[PDB]
From a paper:
[name]-[name]-2 infection is initiated upon the attachment of the viral transmembrane Spike (S) glycoprotein to the angiotensin-converting enzyme 2 (ACE2) in host cells. The S1 subunit contains an N-terminal domain (NTD) and a receptor-binding domain ([name]) which includes a β-strand core and a receptor-binding motif (RBM) that is largely consisted of loops. Here, we report a human monoclonal antibody ([name]) isolated from a convalescent patient infected with the prototype strain (Wuhan-Hu-1).
To accurately characterize the [name] epitope, we crystalized the [name] scFv (scAb08) in complex with [name] in the space group of P21 and determined the crystal structure to a resolution of 2.8 Å. Interestingly, there existed eight copies of the scAb08: [name] complex related by non-crystallographic symmetry in an asymmetric unit. [name] bound [name] at one side of the high chair away from the receptor-binding motif (RBM) with a buried surface area (BSA) of 1247.9 Å2. Among the six complementarity-determining regions (CDRs), L-CDR2 made no direct contact with [name] while heavy chain CDR1 (H-CDR1), H-CDR2, H-CDR3, L-CDR1 and L-CDR3 contributed to a BSA of 120.7, 269.9, 404.0, 218.4, and 146.2 Å2, respectively. A peculiar feature of [name] was that the H-CDR3 aligns with a loop in the ‘backrest’ region, forming an antiparallel β-sheet with 3 backbone-mediated H-bonds. Although the [name] epitope was adjacent to the RBM, the two did not overlap. Thus, it covered ~17% of the total [name] residues but only one of the 15 mutations (~7%) from the Omicron strain BA.1 occurred in the [name] epitope. Compared with BA.2, BA.4/BA.5 contains a single mutation (L452R) which is also found in the Delta strain. Contrasting to the abovementioned neutral mutations, L452R occurred at the [name] epitope, explaining its drastic impact on binding and neutralizing activity.
Residue numbers in the entry:
A (entry chain A): 334 to 533
B (entry chain B): 2 to 124, 998 to 1111
Write the structure that this text describes.
């Protein structure tokens, strides 16, 4: 049948960027224009593909990665970018083929005192590889003194909370991100646009 | 650490129960304390958890607005309160530590468990997202396998699969973390694998002492939570 896109975009729960979610879209027909027509998206950036030609294309593997970041970090989701989110939370490949979609979610993911249940990693010994996910809770050793497993001098817990308050600036307001990854191999297709599909 | 839980409680329908989980060390140091339920006809269900050092919470959609999880580093005790109790809520409620790591398909597992607190509510069915055969039989000294078949949302997405071993009268115990890795104390005869939407647990040199229930755990992004399998009773002839 049709691809489960509303399940990804309209999901009742979004993950923290450090524990970003992934869904495979497979054995389905993908109506992309219903998402590209929508005027609800602050960002719709496609790399290596065209938002229109997608409906006349077929792909071997398609992944939808979802998470929540703040506005000023949406620029980091693009390929070849640097920063805490790109280096330590969600890295895109330089050969990335797919679209990055974002929308302001202040009405859902913000509370007056602050919604602190959305986390990010600001400390890591190495940079993430493309599409790696790090959900470790180990204390980070920012200096030469070992940490002995507890937070202290130059020994930090590597996760902090976005404080999402409705009065914040848009650059500090929560943004929900969905990343469509498109992969074409010499192998059977699992997702095809409608222009290459048969519907009874 | 060792996780010690509260005593058994008998409650009436519509009442509320609040159970406690206290750590031996007395620090709750950078740990994530999760609550996993085992209710007849509903299998193993992750309910939620908290990272005490941050105080941030995470609940399962099925129990949200009905469960409340708190932690207090002073007492080194975490609490879980279930409201509007129903007869189906009768279950062995476990407290467990939630571990993490860094790979492309990394997802949490539960390495340390408590004995479990029993809650009986006095006076339908939940189908698992991961499918296992109810029963598998094997002869001693031969190789046996158990299958776990997730949908596109979990194993198809690439999420790793972990395995838990549960003996009669005991609590679930980690057997395989990651797709193939073994905690210390697990024999080399146990092995794991993942391909496509399915995962496998292989036991070689099968012995009578391997006769137990085996579960597979993955992360389902359609539910945004950890999911367990229906369980497989291995029988050694
Ligand atoms: C996503 O949802 C948008 C809003 O529609 C309303 O909200 C969702 C949660 C459903 O309850 C729906 O029945 C409501 O009408 C829609 O504009 C959009 O088409 C939906 N799907 C996608 C792929 O964006
Ligand atoms: Ca026997
Ligand atoms: Cl949790």
């Amino acid at each position: 049948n049709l691809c489960p896109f509303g399940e990804v975009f309209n999901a009742t729960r979004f993950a923290s960027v450090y524990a970003w979610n992934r869904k495979r879209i497979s054995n389905c027909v993908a109506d992309y224009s219903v998402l590209y027509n929508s005027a609800s998206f602050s960002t719709f950036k496609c790399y290596g593909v065209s938002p229109t030609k997608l409906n006349d294309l077929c792909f071997t593997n398609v992944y939808a990665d979802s998470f929540v970041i703040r506005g000023d970090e949406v620029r980091q989701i693009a390929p070849g970018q640097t920063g805490k989110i790109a280096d330590y939370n969600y890295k895109l490949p330089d050969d990335f083929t797919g679209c990055v979609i974002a929308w302001n979610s202040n009405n859902l993911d913000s509370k007056v005192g602050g919604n602190y249940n959305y986390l990010y990693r600001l400390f890591r010994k190495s940079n993430l590889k493309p599409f790696e996910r790090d959900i470790s809770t180990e204390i980070y050793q920012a200096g030469s003194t070992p940490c002995n497993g507890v937070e202290g001098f130059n020994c930090y817990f590597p996760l902090q909370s976005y404080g999402f308050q409705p009065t914040n600036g848009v650059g500090y307001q929560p943004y929900r991100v969905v990343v469509l990854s498109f992969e074409l191999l010499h192998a059977p297709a699992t997702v095809c646009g409608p222009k290459k599909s048969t519907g009874t | 650490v060792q996780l010690v839980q509260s005593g058994a409680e008998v409650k009436k329908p519509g009442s509320s129960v609040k159970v406690s989980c206290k750590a031996s060390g007395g620090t709750f140091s950078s740990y994530t304390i999760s609550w996993v339920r085992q209710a007849p006809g509903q299998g193993l269900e992750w309910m939620g958890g908290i990272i005490p050092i941050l105080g941030t919470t995470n609940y399962a959609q099925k129990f949200q607005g009905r469960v409340t999880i708190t932690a207090d580093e002073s007492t080194s005790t975490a609490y879980m309160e279930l409201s509007s109790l129903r007869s189906e809520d009768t279950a062995v409620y476990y407290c467990a530590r939630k571990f993490g790591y860094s790979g492309y398909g990394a997802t949490w597992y539960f390495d340390l468990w408590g004995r479990g607190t029993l809650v009986t509510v006095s006076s339908g069915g939940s189908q698992s997202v991961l499918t296992q055969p109810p029963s598998v039989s094997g002869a001693p000294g031969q190789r046996v396998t158990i299958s776990c078949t997730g949908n596109s949302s979990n194993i198809g997405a690439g999420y790793d699969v972990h395995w838990y071993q549960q003996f009669p009268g005991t609590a679930p115990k980690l057997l395989i973390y990651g797709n193939s890795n073994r905690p210390s104390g697990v024999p080399d005869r146990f092995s794991g694998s993942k391909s496509g939407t399915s995962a496998s647990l292989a036991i070689t040199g099968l012995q009578a002492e391997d006769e137990a229930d085996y579960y597979c755990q993955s992360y389902d992004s359609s539910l945004s939570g950890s999911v367990f399998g229906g369980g497989t009773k291995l029988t050694v002839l």
